[PDB]
TrEMBL record, chain A:
This is Thaliana 60S ribosomal protein L7. Belongs to the universal ribosomal protein uL30 family.
TrEMBL record, chain D:
GO terms for cellular component: cytosolic large ribosomal subunit. The chain holds residues 6 to 51 of 60 of the full protein. Keywords: Ribonucleoprotein, Ribosomal protein. It comes from Solanum lycopersicum. Residues 10-26 have a biased composition (Basic residues). One of its GO terms (molecular function) is structural constituent of ribosome. The keyword Aminoacyl-tRNA synthetase does not apply. Residues 1-46 are annotated as: Disordered. This is 60S ribosomal protein L29.
TrEMBL record, chain E:
Transmembrane segments: none annotated. This is 60S ribosomal protein L21. GO terms for cellular component: cytosolic large ribosomal subunit. Belongs to the eukaryotic ribosomal protein eL21 family. It comes from the Eukaryota. One of its GO terms (molecular function) is structural constituent of ribosome. Coiled coil: none annotated. GO terms for biological process: translation. It holds the Pfam family Ribosomal_L21e. InterPro entries: Ribosomal_eL21, Ribosomal_eL21_CS, Ribosomal_eL21_sf, Translation_prot_SH3-like_sf. Keywords: Ribonucleoprotein, Ribosomal protein.
UniProtKB/TrEMBL annotation, chain F:
The chain holds residues 357 to 403 of 406 of the full protein. It comes from the Eukaryota. It comes from Solanum lycopersicum (Tomato). Belongs to the universal ribosomal protein uL4 family. This is Large ribosomal subunit protein uL4 C-terminal domain-containing protein. The gene is LOC101259570.
Length: 48, 177, 48, 46, 163, 44
RNA sequence: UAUUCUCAAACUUUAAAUAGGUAGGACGGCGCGGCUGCUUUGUUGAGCCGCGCCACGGAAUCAAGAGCUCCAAGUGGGCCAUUUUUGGUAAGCAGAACUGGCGAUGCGGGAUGAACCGGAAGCCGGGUUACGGUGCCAAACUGCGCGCUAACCUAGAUCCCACAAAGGGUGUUGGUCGAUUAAGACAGCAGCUGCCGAAUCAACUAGCCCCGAAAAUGGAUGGCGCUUAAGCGCGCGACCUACACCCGGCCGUCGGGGCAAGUGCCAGGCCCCGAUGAGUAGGAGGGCGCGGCGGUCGCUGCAAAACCUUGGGCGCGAGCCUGGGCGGAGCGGCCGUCGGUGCAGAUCUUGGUG
């Protein structure tokens, strides 16, 4: 994994389609920062 | 179909240790907007009520609870604790809704309106389906009438869709109850 | 081969959860091995 | 009068630089009695 | 000098521990120090000779010289953008043998034998340690569930032991 | 379109339904609220 | 003697969080020998040396790489903010600690603002966002929902932020505890009591509103206005909006690669690939322009220089080329080399002119 992952250049994603809620607050508080577990996939769709 | 707030049962325990290979298993019924936030609030109470932090705890099961009969009307009582600008208080509220999710949504909306209490300053102690004869609030009793009857005093005038919206009209709205 | 493995793992997890339910116990899912991290704040005013 | 503001930032521009470490270190400041015998031991080494 | 003496601000650092004053136990004087060993500098307040400057208290260094009553110690010191290798001599009463490398020697031997055993069987392996990884899935037998709920508030309990 | 018409034994299906139904009962189970002796009347 | 209320920057048994030091191999390990004037009762130690053998790199992640030297500029008035913090009643006051920011820096938002929020930038097209917004000013809903408020004080209206307190209200909305009531309460009526036939009384609590609340040019939620809010609290959907992010084009910079029995080249060149672009003080590179000198290639009475032009074109730019006019005798390109070599400022100098 170390070699395979390092081989990948960091992904240059676009601004999320639909925007963010609040980057200044944690996802638990209703914001966008921190661990969102399986909900990262929903964000990946809108940013890829 | 879609609810702002969802009810979950969260089950967790402290990590097994040599002294206790089978630590007690704790369950809670928590309200949150999704699973991730339900888990976070579960560890908040376990940390402060059972002295079990997430770093030394284990998440076992998380399941969402759905209303059994979402087509009928039930009376819901909610016992809650909230923080005001000067301290903490306990209050009991009643609501009428087809699902307890809607009743909990009403509770949060009412607390914000009548008391300026934000969501994070509320702890739900108990919820239950109250039979009509055991209700206490008059806002709920007055609708316990087999012959419920009243007119629509206030109506919202608007086209069915904005497609039929025009700035100018030849005559004023004709309204009657 | 990889496609078959992915489907088997998905069905394997479902079977285990159902098996625990039937016996009245709990099945703790394996902890996530992979994370995807996205930067949501800019490069201004960065603590060291 | 005095302030350490910005001084850590200046230090980290090119630092923190660790000194170059060589396999053999200088013997200056060590016990002369030990050093003198070591010189004789190498002299007669064969 | 220049506004501060040698032992300024050492009221607590150089004071002896509570109920641990008086005679120094003789295991301190029976320690053996060799070149290359690691030692932690801990100033003993009773011994006023060969005592290091307060900066070196609580620092770990490498032994580079041995004398009759003292050991030369190399201590890193950060001055602006550089690290300096400060060489100081300290009486053995102020130094303790450090256990920072206690796991190294034993680890090397275990790695050597594991590679030797794997070499004979032609199986390439790695002896590197790894940090704690994610746990695998498992089943937990059902048991009695204790329900936890928020507690109703009581003002009388907002004080240690109550009002 | 053709309205064309089981993978579990009949006995197994009954056990599955019972286990899930029992699990749901624990999900909606409530505390007895007995440890709150000062708020027994308020909690009902 | 046993208890008890309340305390300490210059008290303390105990004692965090954050931060600080060291270590995680090839400069490792083992075996057999050797050297010594040091060391030991002792080839006992200590360090070093020679030979032989072993050593999958000995936690994670990253590594637009690492080390070393020389010469030298500028600077050595700082200021702001979260937090910790000293003096002071306090200060847009004075002085420290860690980090960031401004200064040196535009750009979007905060009406307006060096420091707040977002975010840092080559020249463009498209897409999407951040903060902030979607009644008009003004790009985007008078969008879909619940409640609260009614201000006869200029009701209220968004971090920094441009203020308001103690204390009060039978204003109104929620909640908490207690008391009373179909065996008849409460108000009134009647002579403790009868008529009376449905709820009533008291305290506390906290939302919004109101009182408390006085200043000098006329004026400021930014303005207009807004009350089935366009106010306040909490939601939902969509939408608007940066020089930020994504895709594409082009310019520069940095790094990488290809090109000779040369059909072979301003190789100081051509071609291909990847990343990247803020800048005061300051440094450096490549270029533009002026006047000579050594050379070289030219122009000119069939019209040189200078000057004029609503002519045209080239270069990111310093500048350059050219049409027409005026003028009437000199001038230019290129290589090298040289210098009294480039102006908007100096209450600059002289002259001229409003
Ligand atoms: K002093
Ligand atoms: K200087
Ligand atoms: K009130
Ligand atoms: K010439
Ligand atoms: K011209
Ligand atoms: K020249
Ligand atoms: Mg990128
Ligand atoms: Mg869109
Ligand atoms: Mg936003
Ligand atoms: Mg911030
Ligand atoms: Mg910021
Ligand atoms: Mg002096
Ligand atoms: Mg000093
Ligand atoms: Mg100066
Ligand atoms: Mg100064
Ligand atoms: Mg000053
Ligand atoms: Mg300046
Ligand atoms: Mg403003
Ligand atoms: Mg654009
Ligand atoms: Mg509206
Ligand atoms: Mg008040
Ligand atoms: Mg405004
Ligand atoms: Mg591009
Ligand atoms: Mg630049
Ligand atoms: Mg010339
Ligand atoms: Mg003109
Ligand atoms: Mg020229
Ligand atoms: Mg001259
Ligand atoms: Mg001059
Ligand atoms: Mg001039
Ligand atoms: Mg000038
Ligand atoms: Mg003048
Ligand atoms: Mg003049
Ligand atoms: Mg004049």
């Amino acid at each position: 994994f170390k070699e395979a992952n390092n081989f990948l250049w960091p992904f240059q994603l676009k601004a999320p389609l639909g925007g963010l809620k609040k980057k200044r607050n944690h996802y638990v508080e209703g914001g966008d920062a921190g661990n969102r577990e399986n909900f990262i996939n929903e964000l990946i769709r809108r940013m890829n | 179909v879609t609810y702002k707030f969802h009810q979950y049962q969260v089950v967790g325990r402290a990590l097994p240790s040599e002294n206790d290979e089978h630590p007690k298993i704790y369950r809670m019924k928590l309200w949150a907007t999704n699973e991730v936030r339900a888990k976070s609030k579960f560890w908040y109470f376990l940390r402060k009520l059972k002295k079990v932090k997430k770093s030394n705890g284990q998440m076992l099961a998380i399941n969402e609870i759905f209303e059994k009969y979402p087509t009928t009307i039930k009376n819901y009582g909610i016992w809650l604790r909230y923080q005001s600008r000067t301290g903490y208080h306990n209050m009991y509220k009643e609501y009428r809704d087809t699902t307890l999710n809607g009743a909990v949504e009403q509770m949060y909306t009412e607390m914000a309106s009548r008391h300026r209490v934000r969501h994070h300053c509320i702890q739900i102690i108990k919820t239950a389906t109250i039979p009509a004869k055991l209700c206490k609030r008059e806002s709920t009793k007055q609708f316990h009438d087999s012959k419920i009857k009243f007119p629509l005093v206030f109506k919202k005038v608007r086209p069915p869709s904005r497609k039929l919206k025009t700035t100018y009209k030849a005559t004023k709205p004709n309204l009657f109850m | 081969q990889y496609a078959k493995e992915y489907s088997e793992q998905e069905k394997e997890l479902i079977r285990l959860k159902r098996e625990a339910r039937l016996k009245g116990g709990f099945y703790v899912d394996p902890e996530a091995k992979l994370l995807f991290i996205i930067r949501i704040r800019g490069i201004n005013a960065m603590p060291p | 009068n005095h302030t350490a503001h910005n001084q850590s930032y200046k230090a980290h521009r090119n630092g923190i630089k660790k000194p170059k470490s060589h396999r053999h270190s200088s013997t200056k400041g060590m016990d002369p009695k030990f050093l003198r015998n070591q010189r004789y031991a190498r002299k007669h080494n064969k | 000098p220049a506004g501060h003496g040698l032992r300024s601000r050492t009221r607590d650092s150089f004071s002896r521990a509570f109920r641990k004053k008086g005679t120094i136990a003789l295991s301190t004087y029976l320690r053996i120090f060799k070149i290359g060993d690691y030692v932690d500098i801990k100033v003993n307040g009773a011994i006023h000779k060969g005592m290091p400057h307060k900066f070196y208290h609580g620092r770990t260094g490498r032994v580079w010289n041995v004398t009759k009553r003292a050991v030369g110690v190399e201590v890193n010191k950060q001055v602006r953008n550089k690290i300096l290798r400060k060489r100081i001599h300290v009486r053995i009463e102020h130094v303790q043998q450090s256990r920072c490398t206690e796991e190294v020697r034993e680890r090397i031997k275990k790695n050597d034998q594991l590679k030797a055993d794997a070499k004979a069987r032609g199986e390439v392996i790695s002896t590197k340690r790894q940090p704690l990884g994610p746990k695998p899935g498992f089943m937990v037998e059902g048991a009695t569930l204790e329900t936890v709920t928020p507690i109703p508030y009581d003002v009388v309990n907002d004080l240690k032991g109550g009002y | 379109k053709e309205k064309l018409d089981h993978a579990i034994t009949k006995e197994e299906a009954s056990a599955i339904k019972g286990a899930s139904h029992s699990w749901y009962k624990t999900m909606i189970s409530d505390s007895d609220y007995a440890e709150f002796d000062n708020f027994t009347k308020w909690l009902g």
